[PDB]
Symmetry: none
Subunit: 546 residues, 3 copies
């Protein structure tokens, strides 16, 4: 029963043989472009050393599992020889590599290795599971505090700087201008790449947990740059990394002084009172709460369409994050957040990982390398560790009002003393979720869809929270499921769904356009504004780099 695995390894071994042919021809051609006066990528042999381990360990496992029907040690001895062969071949393959690149790979390998160990994160820590296993009361807080301060202190002492990525050069490099800056955000308007653009502009509301540039990573996988290339004027909210000065900022402020203020900022830049809204994770929650706020107060509609990525409105199924949703734990965090003023992102980093794609190594290290790309896994790892703080009041509200009491579903949620009913929102909504998502379980995102009072569409994408959402059409990598019909259950919806391979981005673009008709307007060249894109807020790091 090893056929499909040897087939996958054989497929990669042939793609690697072709690349070695390319590098050999590349090194020879570089010798031609030489002058007498003058004084990055990893070697294919480094990947070949890893490919040989996977093949030899599988062969040894198959050989000793047919021999099964001494025995434990002999397999161990042969597997240690494979590890030793792997150490020698890797060190050899990095012979001509400059020391700086070696420390880069040593850095990114250590991130990957630490991230794939469940004990390194509180949400998947087995010892913390024992405490929650109906074992105790308030010591749970102390037991949780010991694990957190130990996981943190381990990451403190681990915390290389120079060998990193620079925002605006390597990531988040879509041309544009910062056209408005307030306490909570920097509003970026991106430069056009088309002669004509749509009249109704696009406003992207990112999550305030982690930074926005997951949606503008590199030109090949940038949602922002793809949207601009589809003739859309694209605006991005770039949240401030909050400090102690932002301690009293609440979820209500992000809705009103954030999304709503950004909508007004779009009107100042374009003259349009209505925008197409796109929201990701807690930003998708903030976008929905902004629509409910406007509708409850009978304000004129300002969102023509709304696409929500991995957005939780019903928190009944919190996933692994449910381990923290217990009154003693929530109360203890509320005390810390009031005293410290913020929830440290570096503490949130040891609590849970927003990046747990099941195939980060194979699809975004090995596959991206063989596609001629700088490993996308390095970029993803940089983003997951570019932690943001969370304002203490906002984090308390997220913990209690949404995760614990589920106020939005129950109709008890109030934003600036205005009760929020999503049934009054008539904006058409498209919810795009991911089947392997571990932060916003796709069944729970489905449940929130019925809360809206207008047109409702749902798309289920293959893969997880990041990989499934940030899937550019040119990649041709995954698929999605579409069902226009209404259903009584998440499972019934899937049963009636149809599967399509590739990116779901064109479906979102179809959803946005079919609504608009409105004539294409001349391309909007962004005003000079306050600063070039990306802003200053996105570069503020919790562990500063030099």
């Amino acid at each position: 029963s090893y056929g499909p695995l040897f087939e996958a390894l054989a497929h990669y071994n042939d793609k690697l043989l072709a690349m070695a042919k390319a590098q050999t021809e590349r090194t020879a051609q570089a010798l031609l472009q030489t002058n007498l006066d003058d004084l990055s990528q990893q070697p294919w042999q480094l990947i070949q050393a890893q490919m040989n381990w996977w093949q030899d360990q599988l062969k040894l496992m198959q050989h000793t599992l047919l021999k099964s029907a001494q025995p434990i040690y002999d397999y161990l001895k042969q597997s240690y020889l494979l590890t030793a062969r792997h150490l020698l071949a890797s060190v050899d393959a990095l012979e001509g590599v400059p020391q700086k690149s070696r420390e880069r790979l040593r850095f990114f390998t250590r991130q990957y290795v630490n991230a794939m160990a469940p004990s390194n994160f509180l949400a998947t820590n087995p010892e913390l599971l024992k405490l929650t296993l109906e074992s105790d009361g308030q010591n749970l807080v102390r037991g949780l505090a010991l694990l957190a301060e130990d996981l943190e202190r381990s990451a403190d002492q681990l915390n290389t700087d120079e060998s990193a990525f620079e925002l605006g050069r390597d990531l988040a490099l879509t041309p544009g201008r910062v056209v408005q800056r307030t306490e909570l955000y920097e509003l970026i308007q991106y430069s056009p790449t088309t002669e004509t653009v749509g009249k109704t502009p696009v406003l992207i509301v990112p999550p305030f947990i982690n930074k926005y540039y997951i949606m503008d990573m590199r030109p090949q996988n940038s949602l922002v740059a793809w949207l601009v290339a589809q003739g859309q004027t694209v605006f991005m909210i770039s949240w401030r990394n909050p400090g102690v000065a932002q301690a009293q900022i609440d979820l209500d402020d992000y809705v009103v002084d954030g999304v709503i203020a950004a909508l007004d900022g779009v009107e100042a830049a374009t003259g349009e009172r209505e925008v197409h809204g796109i929201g990701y994770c807690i930003g998708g929650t903030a976008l929905s709460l902004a629509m409910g706020w406007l509708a409850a107060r009978r304000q004129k509609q300002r969102v023509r369409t709304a696409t929500l990525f991995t957005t939780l409105l019903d928190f009944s199924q919190p996933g692994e994050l449910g381990i923290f949703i217990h009154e003693p734990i929530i109360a203890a965090l509320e005390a810390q957040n009031e005293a410290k003023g913020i929830m440290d992102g570096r503490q949130l980093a040891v609590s849970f990982s927003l990046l747990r794609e099941n195939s980060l190594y194979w699809n975004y290290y090995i596959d991206s390398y063989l596609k001629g790309q700088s490993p996308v896994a390095f970029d993803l790892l940089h983003w997951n560790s570019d932690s943001t703080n969370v304002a203490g009041k906002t984090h308390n509200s997220l913990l209690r009002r949404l995760y614990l009491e589920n106020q939005l579903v129950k109709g008890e949620l109030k934003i600036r003393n205005t009760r929020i009913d999503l049934g009054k929102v008539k904006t058409p909504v498209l919810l795009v979720s991911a089947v392997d998502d571990h932060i916003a379980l796709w069944q729970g995102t489905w449940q929130g869809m019925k809360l809206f009072g207008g047109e409702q569409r749902f798309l289920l994408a293959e893969s997880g929270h990041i990989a499934g959402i940030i899937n550019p059409p040119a990649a041709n990598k995954y698929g999605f499921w579409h069902n226009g019909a209404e259903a009584e259950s998440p499972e019934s919806w899937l049963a009636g769904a149809t599967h399509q391979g590739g990116s779901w981005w064109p479906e979102m673009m179809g959803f946005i356009q079919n609504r608009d008709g409105s004539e294409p307007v001349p391309a909007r060249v962004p005003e000079e504004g306050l600063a070039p894109a990306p802003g200053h807020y996105v570069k503020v790091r919790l562990n500063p780099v030099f």
Copy 2:
């Protein structure tokens, strides 16, 4: 006659818009400073805009109705809408201001409200003005009691930090005064030092308020070694101190103290109000006894030597009342400063709200009016026998204009003083009427000069060249009638301090005198003794 008032309000409203634009750009710039570990014009500009809205709308309404149910009830109602709008706009402008900060504005506003009410002061109370032997003396006391207790209920800034912060040293401490020598701010200073004799009816630090409006700091910056007498707040232990003591043991003793610190027997004299009078009697005392002259120049701010025009203080100067106070002062030991603060106010500028609260705020300063009200309410006692001497020997009998006054059994005669004398008075002065001070100049026997400031008792005196806020009248000719010197007087504008500086300068440089260690840092301890802790 509505033109210049709408223009002045337009001038102020335009200055408030520019300050508001400066604050919005400063908050916008503060966003670029985004340190994650530290937290990022105390009055809001909206609060001042609410005041300016009231002034403009009431002036609009009152021009509108003066052009023509009852037409008067209509004006009464509409102005009440403006008062209500002003109340609502003020409370809304103070929403983000801290509660402890809001308790401040309620404090000083109440002071200004009570300080411009004539009924709250005896000298300007209509009921007292309508007065008869015992009935007057018993009544004045009864009225004094009603005003003092009302002030007390209302009564329920730090010296050296917010006010009186010029660096210096206390070089000598006697029973009556602390002598302050200030540190130099220039590499070179004049040889002859400067000694300032402040009034002892109020504390000294009106002449040293803030760096922008401190006379002491300006004089040091002009290359002068400046000394300052700091009168002690007299308690009951000082019940038998006199003007004579303040002259000899207060002023002349300080002259010997100044020589001990510099080696100079001659100083440039500067006197303020009753401090200028005490200096004048001191100068005659040296002249009447034929001692070598120890005062080079004498600048006298609002100095009263002829008391024929007492002003509103006249109601107090009657023979039955003086005797009443003479018996009470000796019985109680001293005259209570809290009662003297109730008697009258030194804070009666015609533009205290406009030039020292609004103009101060628009210049970026913390409101100067707040500091003046803190100083006026920081009253100091006056010794029982000094006060009795001032009421009878000077205010009533007027012994200085005649030859009957004596300082420690020594007949005075200002005609024997040959020192150049400069009088700086105020047109709106209500304590020292400028005609009386000008007449009292003629008692001197040396060169004389008279300068008239454009404002009241303290605003026309505390006017630095950097303010460029007021003006002054001068006239080089000699005139014999009050309307004759002023009719021929010419208006210059700006501060008269450079003109007072020139008078001292016209009559070789010495390395800057660094004050010795002395007894304590300036400000001294006497200035901090408050009647109400």
Copy 3:
């Protein structure tokens, strides 16, 4: 000219002092009996009125004399602010926000420029076809956005059914256009003929059911009368085609059928207010034109307009280009927004709401009536688009009812065919329905006619319960040829005209019938339609 003013001030100061002493003796006697807005606030305002009037006397007796008065008036304003917040020390924060909100409402309501009808600039623009419309649009949007932030703002606004419109009853019918309320008897025996009340569809009805001390519904009920009330739905865009005709037939007349269903009586006593009185008049006209048996025994009409030739201050809108523009907007949106009508005119403009319904109301121990009136006036309702066009064009502009050209569902209306006795009750200071114009409409009727003129304005003169003993009215049973002649022959009476209305209704008589208890309806009174707000409350 200051004497009456000073005397009135001391007149008010005496009650405050008298009421202030009653509070010290009540709290002193409260020390003995134990087991187990501040007056100071009103006194601060009283001091400002007296001190300012004293100042104006002195000043009336160059740049300095002017500035000296202007300075002095500012010290009075500072004293007012200082004393006012001082009196509000121990008052709870929840009530202070209510005082601070209703005060803000009053100041804006007293600025003539805040309403289009009294707007100075619009009068200049009117005195210019497309230009007038575009200019009027500029003031309309400027005033609507300026009223956004100020109106929207707290939960201290009263709750219907608890503080206002709390007269017990049951909602016995619910149609698209209205909910029918039948109230509880409170008396052993009621009159055989029931009373039906038709309120205006512009603004809500609770103005007649404010509080038990001034509720017309509660007073009518206590007078042994079965009282019905029509609670108009706040129309949304789904009601865009509802016309004036539908409010007459599917409104008043359908409600007449509802009254018969719940009592068995085909004949009712009619009471109408403002455009409700117009609809009631048109319903009687419709019934008479089709020769149906009389269903309205008596009709009393409060400040109702049948002749629109004297539109008062509202006539600034009655011009061909303005009405044409409004019709286009009403057809586009489907609805005339009540938030836009809020800044167009005020239905509430008493001469002294502050003196008669805040100061006086406080002196009588009541919660300030000026607050309840302002809450009602701010409780705007939309108007169905076709209905508003009909009101603007067919009545205000063309005046079809007087000329006999008005058609209600293809039925020409002639009020001369109506033989129901009519009692028109108008207000001398009314600014919406000028009383002389209401007198001209009286003659249109073909039966008995009576006219009563009340002393106050549009609201205060009408809602004057007999227990207040506050105003008077003029009655004259003889016919006259002009409003001026009718008033010259009138006789003034002090007090409320409500008993005279009940004399009018009851003197037609019959035998008292046993009190009709409402059946368990769809909902308790007041229903759901009256709670629908244009700006939702928190």
